[PDB]
């Protein structure tokens, strides 16, 4: 249970805006990981530092996506993630 809460604030059917509030603890960076819920080969990923909002683009419209936010405090160590299922 880290970047707690976590939600989606944006439209276009090709894009999406995640934001979270992750005070104490300390996070080195977050890795955002997203793909079509079903096919695991579709999953992609990008990295955001100790800020608190991300933006995903180039999504297929009307498709069931699964976003995960992994909160890494030191390269290979990360606190438990949060996921969201969202249709574009």
């Amino acid at each position: 249970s880290v970047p707690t809460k976590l939600e989606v604030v944006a439209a276009t059917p090709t894009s999406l805006l995640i934001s979270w509030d992750a005070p104490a603890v300390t996070v080195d960076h977050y890795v955002i990981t997203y793909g079509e819920t079903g096919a695991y080969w579709s999953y992609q990923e990008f990295t955001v530092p100790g800020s608190k909002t991300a933006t995903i683009s180039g999504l297929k419209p009307g498709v069931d996506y699964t976003i995960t936010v992994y909160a890494y405090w030191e390269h290979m160590y990360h606190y438990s993630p949060i996921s969201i299922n969202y249709r574009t």
Binding site: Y43, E45, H75, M76
Partner: protein, 124 residues
């Protein structure tokens, strides 16, 4: 012998430090450059080192032990690499994982070839 435990420990410590420093300066969880850098640089130099130590088998033990077994053994890692790849797999990004694994494997092999080659080239 006791000289040898020292020869290794020194190199091992130097390499391990360099790797770690590299890993601070270059390394995120998304794609671990600091690791790959160390693993590839290591892969290269060991190609060099091996070509030099066959061509001069007369040299004393402590050199090979400190250069190769120590320095290049600590500079490089399979542990970290493995943990980082699994990390990716666990994240679901199998492409990336494969990429990092291929990079790390093919890369190191290549480097070692070029390291051997660079020595065979510069002794003719």
């Amino acid at each position: 012998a006791p000289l040898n435990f020292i020869a290794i420990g020194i190199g091992a410590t130097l390499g391990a430090w360099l790797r770690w420093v590299l890993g601070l300066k270059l390394n995120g969880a998304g794609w671990p450059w600091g690791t790959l850098t160390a693993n590839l640089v290591g892969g290269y130099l060991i190609g060099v080192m091996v070509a030099l130590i066959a061509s001069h088998p007369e040299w004393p033990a402590w050199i090979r032990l400190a250069a190769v077994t120590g320095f290049l053994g600590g500079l490089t890692t399979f542990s970290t690499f493995s943990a980082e790849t699994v990390d990716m797999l666990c994240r679901g990004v199998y492409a990336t994982a494969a990429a990092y694994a291929g990079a790390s494997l093919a890369g190191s092999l290549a480097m070692t070839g070029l390291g051997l080659a660079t020595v065979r080239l510069l002794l003719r």
